[PDB]
Point group: D2
Chain length 428, copies 4
């Protein structure tokens, strides 16, 4: 089996989508402009485990343009876009991914990416840690032949630190999740674009003139709060961290508890990454047809089980939109069954966000592959200069003219005119 | 003869579900039910309505019925009906003649069925766009003495009403509700603010932040569009022919220049002028690759779509109402809704709460015309300010707004009534 | 007497401040550019009565440039800037004004302006209606030889409408006050600009993170609320008009009563134009060191008398800043003794704001004088095409490039390509 | 000599200002609430070198309230508010500082703080490193008796790493400058409040409708841009960092070069911390009466020397406001001679900002004095849990209600419910 896709005939529709996405992903296209001649990944045999979307197809074809051998599988059973996968298969690349895999087929799809034309993998590009854990626990014989790992997920990086503390990790790993360019686009800018899009497709509701309660004021909360405020909603924040709580107050947001705010809100958005945020006792105080949704962590934040078990009516309105009637006579509108509203009720992040994340991945691959004896086994942050480079790559598309330091200004500032321009502890 | 005519009356239960959701978002119409269902002030009325047969309009329809009126209904556009909403109205025993995908002949037919009731011909006209008003004057001028009032809510329709008075054709009193504060601001500003981006997003899924968005026009639509784009992190450039409107944009920090200049800078183009020849061939040729171009102003006149069709070397349809043209220079143009209204072509229009402000405006006008025959001679009138205010007050509860009441002493000082109106007719808000 | 000033040897300083203020008043300078050669006012003896400031000094010299004889007095006792007064006296213009006049001297100064070198006044330019009221009641002989009045005050136009209601107005007038370009700048943009300057100079207080309660959401309220919000304050609104209240809600502001909001606010700002807004029972509920000020109508909005009568301490911190201690042991910081904070604690509106108000005046003078057989004896709004021309005059300074309607476009729209562009009911 | 102040008779005025400041400095009043009974600084002989302002005077009396003996001097010759220094003098606290000191007097004043009644100092509270530099060079005898150093300045902290690298630092030190609660208030929020205050007092110019060029988009630039945008100015950013350039772009600011931007701007503000930002080449292109000022680094950013050397006129308008006429006949308005505009033309940061920086200082002292063993000789960041504590201390004043994690939630998140809540790399 050279690949496995749902329908190869969808390749043409995929290529048209790719062509449109390329123009919103200038960071990846910049890497093609810079590195297509020199091919810094010639020799590399990269196994990738990452959502097989249109955006990811741009990543895959960028890596190939840089000289690498690439074989791919999706890191989720439902997230694949079949036409994107088809387009990649038609271009010769071994890709094992389709929408609605079984749990057995998911494991099998990863298995087909380990050995290549010219022997086993020597690089891992990862999103969730599933490819990394499969090698270590099942195929540890292959570990010495692997030069490096890239990982861009919070779960995956926590897992990498765990493997290092337990002495299990045997390959140097670059964490790109904590890049400024990755984190700000994935957490803040991304959710700022897509939140209200999810709410609108689901409900078509008037945002302006409503009280909106956002639980959490981290990067995701900041983003959501800014989007809602922009439409003319009155935004109330809840926070546990007094620093984040202070930030909110300094922008003019009311900051209070969910115990208080549940009587106020017309819309509730959870962004905490934490369990037990919206509970039965909160639901019972809510205004009629209050909209409740999550954009934070999987499905743990809203007590959905409570609604199923305590409501008198549950009525499906349209896909991923349920309207529960309670014992008190009032209604709750739940979106995406408590799951991520931006993926359940909308299309997730825009292409431009994904460009920042995936450009970080490309940087990490080059850095590990081109500099073998520069990273010992262990989890490493992406160097700042490469993080800056990711940002630089996107400035052209953003109509931005960057100023260059003069030799004299550099000397005064005690930094190189090429970077990095900030110390490692700098918060931006 | 036919008691109603609609695509599929089996969709009525789905209709009722949508009505129930939207009723909560339409407190204006629902407060009308609260205070006038007892007294039934439209009793003995027989209202022929011509208005898009939607969920919102269904709530309008039933509010008219709740207040004692007899109602018969047709849509004012051939594609704008929601069949489930029309089914729900048909299941409730109301003569509705409407479906999505009508012929120009079926459209005319649908309106003709609403003129005669069992107890006699129409008493009142509720209109959007003038077509019901135009049919009775052209073709059924016998009925004109029987008709007590007209409500009209469209710019097109109000202009037409003023043209008919100038020539002495209009034989019925009419209330222009289009120029109400509560109507104009919701329909022009707040509505477009909410739905522009919904249109753009559903069509393209594009990142709005970090883009130059060129907004032609800074009227109320323009102001809303500009504000919406700005809030996403787009750099909004504006074009204007009116120095006051141009000055307003400058005072909010927007760059104001010409389309001749701005066509080189913009990633997104949005027309809001209500005027022809806004975006043109010479502009298209200057644009960046994959410049998203759309319209939220007047029907399809603002963008020269005919130019694109005649001059592009490729035209590929990406999805419904989204076309990607390739030009002779090898660069591409993404056009939304074929130059038609992007918020209605690529999304579902305005939210229920916007529509509530407009439709409560209609209900106010009807009661006023029916209850007070001697008060309005033949001609075009604005809705009185005190009724405009009542529309706004009817939505304050929903908005968690506690309104202050003037003390007797304060009202004497200010020289107004404590119940209003609170502003003179020239006041601009 | 040719003039009367405090010190005519302050004219160097005056001319310097004029030269600065001319650049920020392009509306008046555009009038000099268009009209200095044609002198449309040639034969106009204009008797003015308006605050004798650097700003107004520019207006005075623009009228002269446009070919008019002009004689001036101040419409207020304290508002005259003496260096500006000096400079106008030096250029051979009869100006009778200084800072700290008596009520008797005030009436005398205005009486001197009525009689020119060549006879009685041809025109009236007025702010507050005092010059208009003087000639009707005290000098009824001069009415037939005066072609028109320009008025730019809420006070003044109401008095003009009262005079016309009762039949004691024998000369036609232009109401400039309800021009878009006057109203927006004087009410909205000006107060947005100068409220916070007023508060800061008085207190130096942090705005961000405070609850700021703004009574009234008219043009002043909107200005004040937008400014406070921009600094990161949580703005609460009070209103009696449901339309205005709806507007505030649609921008995300909380809207509640003063009876409720007095327990919340760190800063109170009154803009209603109405009596009995902030009262003793509101003062008793306020947080410690609540700042209370007025930017609306004179001194009727806040019950300052109550504080004087009921406080246990009254300390002056600095000029126009009083700190009261109440029986409950809590403190109130009152700005400007309940007078206008922007004029009491700061310099009032910027020059650019004033340029829009006075260019409206200049237009009114040209319109009445150049068209005698057009305006019959009454109160009129400045024509829209002239309101438009005020705005146009400032666009150059704003770096604005105005589009011109092609003839084909103007036909479609059924208007002229020179205007007016909007109907008379249009609200902007 | 017990103290040396300009005039002790200004202490009733000072106490009055002190009483106002206290209510805006909840951080320091919360430290007085918690620790006034326990007396954690009991025994501590603190020598502080820091601007002798009303704000600092609260910090001083907070340290005394915590059971410390404190001797004080200013860290700048002009920054003392004499009336504040008199209040601290009358409270019986040895303070040696006045407005307008000589460089020999400045030194003298710091030398008077080293020696108390009971003996020599145990602790150093510092701003700019001049107390710390004096003792190591000129009083190394006192080094072993000194338990800890607090320091809150970029200059002062860069200096500790220069000392530590060369083995001369022989006292443990806490860097408080890079705390979240210090950095955000001193840099971003502070300048957001005070920039425009500076420009207004100097010029009274309309901000709305103008192009404003902000050089730099760091914390200072971010604040300055946000403030200008809030008034209705069109803001243009210049940047050398692609990440910060990207951040500006994502909020809809234009990002171009000064070489291009100099032809556009009505207002210019420099925030880079870098030399050669505004130059003669730029000045020659500027619009007539461009307002140019600096809020970044001292007087290096704007080539003020060029203006003095190449302009045909230089005219003082008022203190710290100079208006040059250039060879091309156009005018430039320089503010504060290119020095910090917020301190040159206004009062600097509000009391509430300063509360965050000086509460950091209190936290630093307790942590050093009560835990000597914990800190080896070196430069240490302030621990996060204390940074959090600073923020928590201000929430009460802000009307903020912080949520507390349940035991179950804390367990799920792998953190204590008392904190810290974020890892050390977290950027807020
Ligand atoms: N939906 C998406 O597409 C998407 C995108 C990026 C990240 N995320 C996820 O969203 C979550 C948040 O990400 P982030 O970057 O904002 O994290 P963050 O650490 O920046 O912010 C989370 C905030 O929630 C607060 N918090 C924790 N428990 C709380 C409680 N019980 N009540 C109130 N506040 C509480 C914390 O103080 C913290 O400030 C994560 O789980 C992340 O994986 C989702
Ligand atoms: N999409 C929708 O659902 C929807 C909703 C409401 C209104 N509208 C329509 O939108 C249009 C605009 O409505 P409005 O209330 O903002 O009108 P408006 O009069 O308030 O504003 C239109 C503006 O366009 C400007 N303009 C005209 N020609 C121009 C040109 N060639 N270049 C630049 N500017 C120009 C005018 O100066 C004016 O300020 C109307 O056709 C209206 O019917 C659409
Ligand atoms: N400070 C200045 O230099 C300056 C500048 C311009 C205007 N003004 C003055 O400020 C005042 C307001 O001007 P405006 O143009 O906003 O008038 P406006 O009529 O547009 O607005 C006043 C608002 O106050 C509301 N109001 C009245 N009584 C109220 C009450 N008891 N509680 C709450 N709201 C109440 C009204 O509903 C109205 O919307 C006027 O007196 C005007 O003369 C002052
Ligand atoms: N006036 C005040 O009260 C006050 C308060 C705090 C800090 N500061 C000072 O302000 C300055 C900046 O502080 P910060 O916290 O913003 O530092 P920062 O590092 O966060 O910001 C400085 C920014 O300027 C940019 N920059 C450097 N050289 C440049 C050039 N030639 N052109 C354009 N941009 C350039 C950098 O990319 C950087 O992002 C420092 O000198 C600091 O001491 C002043
Ligand atoms: O995880 C992702 N998508 C996902 C997974 C499961 C799922 N299950 C659903 N339902 C279906 C109806 O029945 C109930 C369960 S919807 C759904 C969506 C996912 C994450 C990041 C990117 C990254 N990304 C973008 O955001 C845009 N391009 C990208 O690559 C994609 C998908
Ligand atoms: O007009 C509406 N809708 C519409 C949709 C498609 C369409 N397609 C057309 N054709 C043209 C000829 O070529 C082919 C395509 S015309 C047309 C019209 C419409 C307006 C107001 C409200 C009012 N409204 C809201 O906005 C929300 N609820 C409402 O009732 C509805 C629909
Ligand atoms: O009315 C104006 N100024 C004014 C009047 C009286 C007054 N009384 C005071 N106190 C002092 C202490 O004892 C008690 C009385 S302070 C004060 C200030 C006034 C209005 C518009 C413009 C128009 N204007 C601007 O706003 C800017 N340039 C202008 O021309 C000016 C002043
Ligand atoms: O350095 C400070 N202020 C200062 C220094 C010198 C100076 N020189 C001037 N001119 C005068 C006319 O001739 C030319 C020289 S004005 C001026 C002002 C300084 C810093 C932080 C805080 C800390 N701070 C605040 O920011 C607010 N409260 C505070 O404690 C204070 C002052």
């Amino acid at each position: 089996l050279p690949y496995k896709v749902a329908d190869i005939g969808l390749a043409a529709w995929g290529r048209k989508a790719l062509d449109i996405a390329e123009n919103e992903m200038p960071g990846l296209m910049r890497m093609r402009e810079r590195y297509s001649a020199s091919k810094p990944l010639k020799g590399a045999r990269i196994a990738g485990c990452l959502h097989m979307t249109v955006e990811t197809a741009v990543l895959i074809e960028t890596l190939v343009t840089l000289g690498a051998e690439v074989q791919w599988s999706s890191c989720n059973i439902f997230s694949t876009q079949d036409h994107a996968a088809a387009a990649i298969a038609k271009a010769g690349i071994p890709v094992y991914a389709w929408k609605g895999e079984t749990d057995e087929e998911y494991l099998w799809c990863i298995e087909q990416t380990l050995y290549f034309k010219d022997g086993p993998l020597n690089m891992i590009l990862d999103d969730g840690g599933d490819l990394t854990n499969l090698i270590h626990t099942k195929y540890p014989q292959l570990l010495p032949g692997i030069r490096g790992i890239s990982e861009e997920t919070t779960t995956g990086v926590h897992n990498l630190y765990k493997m290092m503390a337990n002495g299990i990790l045997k390959v140097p790993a670059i964490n790109v999740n904590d890049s400024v360019t990755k984190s700000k686009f994935d957490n803040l800018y991304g959710c700022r674009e897509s939140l209200i899009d999810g709410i609108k497709r689901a409900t078509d509701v008037m945002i302006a003139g409503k009280v909106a309660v956002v639980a959490g004021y981290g990067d995701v909360g900041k983003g959501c709060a800014q989007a809602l405020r922009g439409f003319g909603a009155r935004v109330i924040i809840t926070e546990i961290d007094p620093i984040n709580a202070l930030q909110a107050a300094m922008e003019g947001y009311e900051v209070t508890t969910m115990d208080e705010a549940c009587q106020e809100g017309n819309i509730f958005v959870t962004t905490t990454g934490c369990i037990d945020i919206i509970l039965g006792r909160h639901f019972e105080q809510m205004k009629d047809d209050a909209i409740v949704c999550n954009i934070g962590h999987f499905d743990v934040e809203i007590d959905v089980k409570w609604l199923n078990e305590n409501a008198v009516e549950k009525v499906n309105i349209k896909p991923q939109v349920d309207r529960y009637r309670l014992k008190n006579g009032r209604r709750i509108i739940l979106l995406a069954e408590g799951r991520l509203v931006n993926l359940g009720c909308a299309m997730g992040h825009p292409s431009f966000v994904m460009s920042n994340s995936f450009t970080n991945q490309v940087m990490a691959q080059i850095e590990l592959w081109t500099h073998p004896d520069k990273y010992p086994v262990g989890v490493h942050f992406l160097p700042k200069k490469l993080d800056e480079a990711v940002a630089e790559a996107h400035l052209g598309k953003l109509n931005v003219k960057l100023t260059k330091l003069t030799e004299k200004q550099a000397q005064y500032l005690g930094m190189s005119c090429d970077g990095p321009f900030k110390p490692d502890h700098y918060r931006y």
